[PDB]
C-alpha cells in the first residue's frame, strides 16, 4: 500500500546497506566451521538438463564436504541428458524429485525442486546454488553462510554479483518491489539463484512454483521477520548471461504472479501471449509450508 | 482481479486481432479525406530538446496540412536547444506549454505536454507522434486515423511497428497487462508514442504524468469503452532504439505506478533506487479530465 513516509533517497542511505550487506566479505572457512556450534549445512543444486555445467559447480563445493558442508546434493529435476551421472562423478549425491518426496507427484518448475529438497536434506542451514553457472567460485557457500553463522537474527542471505545488468531484475522485480515492498529494493539481486536460509524459516513458508520461487521466499521472509532478518553478500564478478527476451517475458509473468500473490494483488491467472503467436502459462498455487506435511511422510522431516 | 474464464490461447485467437487490427492497411489519403464528414484532425508532436529530429518528423506530415490534416502542432516542452525554430522552419506551429494553458503552471513530463495539447488544439480527432523518431514515414497519420474515420465505434488507434523488441514493453507492460487487464495483451505495443483518439474520449479521461501517459490512456479507454473501441495499425518497420537500461528502469517504475493507479492496486509512491547509488521519482497524481476545466479558461475548449 501507500507509504508516503519512505523516499527513494531514504532507501539509498538505508542503515541495512551497512549492517546487513557485505561487499567485501573476509570470513575464512576455518572460522565459519568453528562457528557452526552444532548446526549442519546442506548444499542443494537444482538441475534440469545441465550436463555441461553441473560437475563444475559441484567440484567447487565438494572440498567443503565433511567440514563446513555436511551434505552436497544435486536435486535432479527430470533430466534426460547426462546430468545425473556427471554430478555423481563430480562427488555429489543425486536425488530425483520422486525420491525426495515419493508421496506427491512432481510438478514442473524450479520452485518444486527446492521445495522437495527440504524433505531430502537434514541441514539446519540450506544453501541453494544454481547448477547452470559457467564460472562458479569456491567461496560461494562460505560467503552465503557467513551471516547465518556469525551475525545474529539473519535467516536469509542473498548472494549478488558485481558486473564487469539483469533485465527482469532491473525492469520488473526491483521496480515492482519499489511499488509493493519498497524496503526490499535494498536487495541488489532479489531473483538471484545463490542464497541460504535457516531450516526453521524455509520449512514454514510456502514455495512459489516455477521461476517465482526466489522472489516469493524473499517477500515471505520480509513479511514474517522484517528486513533485518535478510542479508546480502558479494559473490564476485559474473559475466551476465544472454538469455532470449521471449524466455525472459514468460519468466517475468510468473515473477509478477508470485509477487502479486504475496502482496494481496489479485492476479488474473491468465498466461502471457507474445506475437511475431506464442503463449506461456502462469501458476497461482504454491506448495504449502513443508511443516504442514510433518508426521505424514514415510521419511521423517 | 481473477479471470479464470480467459486463457492465453483464447487471447492468441481473439476476434479483435482480426476486426480491429490492420497489419497491411491500404487506405488512401484521398478516401480518408473524403470520409472526414466535417470532423477535423489535429496532429500534435510533443518535443523536449529534439533539434536533430523534429524537422524531419514535421516534414513527413506537412504535405497533409490543409487536406487530411487541419492542424499540425509541435508542443514545445521547455526545450533549450533549437527545437522550436527548427519545427517552425519545417512548417509546424509551435506552442509552448505555457501558451497552451497559461492559467496552470507546467509540470515536467510527457503526459503534461499531451494533456495541455488538448487545450491548444481544435480537431475532433487528435493524433500524437513522437518527435524523436529518426525515420518517420509519411503514412503515419493516415494509417492512425483510418479506423477512426471508416470503422464504427473505434475511439483509440495504436500504431505498432514490425521489427527487422522493446524491453519495457515485453517484460513490464504486456506481462502486467496479462495480470491486470488480460484482454489488453492483444495490443502489440501498448506504450507506443504514435496513436490517435477522438476528442470526446481524450477530454474525458485523466492524463497520467510523465511516461505513464500512453498506458494510462489505453487502460482508461478500455475500462470506459471496452476492447472494441481500440484498434491498432502497422506503421511499418522501425529500427528499435538502444536506450540505456537505467533510463528504462525509471520509466518502468512510472509505467507500474500508472497501471497500478488505474487498476486499484495500492502503489507505495516510493521512487526507484538503483545501485552501481541513484534515485528517480514517480508520480501518483494525474491531471484531471480536461472537460473539468471547461468554462474556466480564457481560451474556450
Ligand atoms: O524446472 C526447472 C527449471 C530450472 N531448474 C534449474 O534451476 C536453475 C535456474 O534455471 P534457468 O532456467 O535459469 O537455467 P537454464 O537451464 O535456463 O540455464 C538451473 O540450475 C536449472 O537447471 C530446475 O532444476 N528445474
Ligand atoms: O518531458 C518530456 C519528455 C518527453 N517528451 C517527448 O516525448 C517523446 C518521447 O520521449 P523519449 O524520452 O522517448 O524521447 P528521447 O528524448 O528520450 O529520445 C519525445 O518526442 C520527447 O521529446 C516531451 O515532450 N516532454
Ligand atoms: Cl562432466
Ligand atoms: Cl514435471
Ligand atoms: Cl534477471
Ligand atoms: Cl521462522
Ligand atoms: Cl532542422
Ligand atoms: Cl516543468
Ligand atoms: Cl519499450
Ligand atoms: Cl467517451
Instruction: Please list, in sequence order, all residues whose beta carbon lies within 8 angstroms of the beta carbon of residue A101, skipping any fewer than 6 positions away.
Output: A116, A119, A120, A297
Distances (CA, A) of A59 to A55, A109, A121, A241, A257: 6, 25, 19, 21, 35
Q: Is the dihedral of CA A184, A189, A191, A195 positive or negative?
A: negative
CA dist., res. A240 & res. A248, Å (int): 14
CA dist., res. A167 & res. A191, Å (int): 11
Domain ranges of chain A: 8-293
Tell me which H or E stretch contains A95: strand A93-96
Cβ–Cβ contact B187 with A under 8 A: no
Instruction: Please list, in sequence order, all residues whose beta carbon lies within 8 angstroms of the beta carbon of residue A226, skipping any fewer than 6 positions away.
Output: none
Longest CA–CA separation in chain A, Å:
57
Neighbouring C-beta atoms of residue A170, cutoff 10 Å: 20
CA dist., res. B266 & res. A170, Å (int): 21
Chain A residues whose beta carbon lies within 8 Å of the beta carbon of residue B172: 171-172, 175, 252
Q: Is the dihedral of CA A175, A178, A180, A186 positive or negative?
A: positive
B57 CA to centre of own chain:
16
In this complex, which of B185, B260, B273 lies closest to A11 when CB atoms are compared? Answer: B273
Residues of chain B numbered 5-24 and touching chain A (CB < 8 Å): 6-9, 11-12
Residue B179 and residue A253 in contact, taking contact as beta carbons nearer than 8 Å: yes
Q: Closest Cα partner for B54 from B65, B41, B63, B45? A: B45
Ligand nearest to the CA of B245: 9
C-alpha radius of gyration, chain B, whole number: 19
Distances (CA, A) of A292 to A109, A177, A259, B38: 21, 29, 22, 70
Distance from CA of B277 to the nearest CA of A (A): 6
PDB experimental method: X-ray
CA dist., res. A185 & res. A154, Å (int): 18
State the residue for C-alpha cell 557467513: A146
Instruction: Please list, in sequence order, all residues whose beta carbon lies within 8 angstroms of the beta carbon of residue B236, skipping any fewer than 6 positions away.
Output: B137, B139, B161, B162
Question: Dihedrals φ, ψ of B192, to 5°?
Answer: -60, 140
CA dist., res. B170 & res. B172, Å (int): 6
Distances (CA, A) of B52 to A19, B49, B57, B87, B132: 48, 8, 10, 10, 8
- All three cell numbers of A105, joined, read 507427484
Chain B residues whose beta carbon lies within 8 Å of the beta carbon of residue A175: 172, 249, 252-253, 256, 272
Q: How many residues does chain A have?
A: 301
3-state secondary structure of B243: coil
- Say which CATH architecture domain A8-293 belongs to: Alpha-Beta Complex (3.90)
Q: Is the dihedral of CA A198, A218, A272, B181 positive or negative?
A: positive
Q: Closest Cα partner for B199 from B112, B96, B110, B122? A: B122
Ligand 5 center from residue B150 Cα (angstroms): 44
Residue A280 and residue A250 in contact, taking contact as beta carbons nearer than 8 Å: yes
Which residues in B243-278 are b (16+ Cβ under 10 Å) and which e?
A: eeeeebbbbbbbbbbbbbbbbebbbbbbbbbbeeee
Resolution in A: 2.0
Amino acid at each position: 500500500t501507500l507509504v508516503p513516509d519512505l523516499t527513494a533517497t531514504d532507501l539509498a542511505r538505508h542503515r541495512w546497506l551497512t549492517d546487513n550487506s557485505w561487499t567485501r566479505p573476509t570470513w575464512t572457512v576455518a572460522e565459519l566451521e568453528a562457528a557452526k556450534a552444532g548446526r549442519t549445512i546442506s548444499v542443494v543444486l537444482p538441475a534440469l538438463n545441465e550436463e555441461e555445467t553441473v560437475g563444475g559447480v559441484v567440484e567447487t563445493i565438494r572440498p567443503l564436504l565433511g567440514g563446513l558442508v555436511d551434505e552436497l546434493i544435486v536435486l535432479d529435476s527430470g533430466s534426460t541428458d547426462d546430468t545425473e551421472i556427471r554430478a555423481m562423478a563430480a562427488g555429489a549425491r543425486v536425488i530425483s524429485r520422486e525420491v525426495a518426496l515419493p508421496e506427491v507427484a512432481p510438478q514442473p518448475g524450479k520452485g518444486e525442486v527446492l521445495w522437495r529438497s527440504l524433505a531430502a536434506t537434514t541441514g539446519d542451514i540450506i544453501v541453494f546454488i544454481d547448477s547452470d553457472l559457467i564460472d562458479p567460485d569456491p567461496m560461494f557457500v562460505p560467503k552465503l553462510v557467513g551471516p547465518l553463522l556469525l551475525s545474529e537474527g539473519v535467516h536469509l542471505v542473498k548472494g549478488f554479483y558485481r558486473r564487469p545488468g539483469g533485465r527482469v531484475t532491473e525492469l520488473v522485480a526491483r521496480p515492482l518491489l519499489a511499488a509493493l515492498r519498497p524496503e526490499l529494493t535494498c536487495v541488489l539481486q532479489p531473483l538471484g539463484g545463490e542464497y541460504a536460509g535457516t531450516r526453521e524459516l524455509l520449512m514454514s513458508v510456502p514455495f512459489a512454483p516455477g521461476y517465482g520461487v526466489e522472489i516469493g521466499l524473499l517477500v515471505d521472509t520480509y513479511d514474517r521477520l522484517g528486513l533485518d532478518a535478510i542479508a546480502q553478500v558479494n559473490l564476485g564478478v559474473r559475466a551476465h548471461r544472454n538469455r532470449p527476451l521471449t524466455d525472459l517475458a514468460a519468466m517475468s509473468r510468473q515473477v509478477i504472479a508470485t509477487l502479486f500473490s504475496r502482496c494481496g494483488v489479485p492476479d488474473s491467472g491468465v498466461g502471457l501471449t507474445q506475437f511475431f503467436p506464442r503463449t506461456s502459462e502462469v501458476s497461482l498455487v504454491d506448495r504449502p509450508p513443508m511443516n504442514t506435511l510433518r508426521g505424514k511422510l514415510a521419511a521423517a522431516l
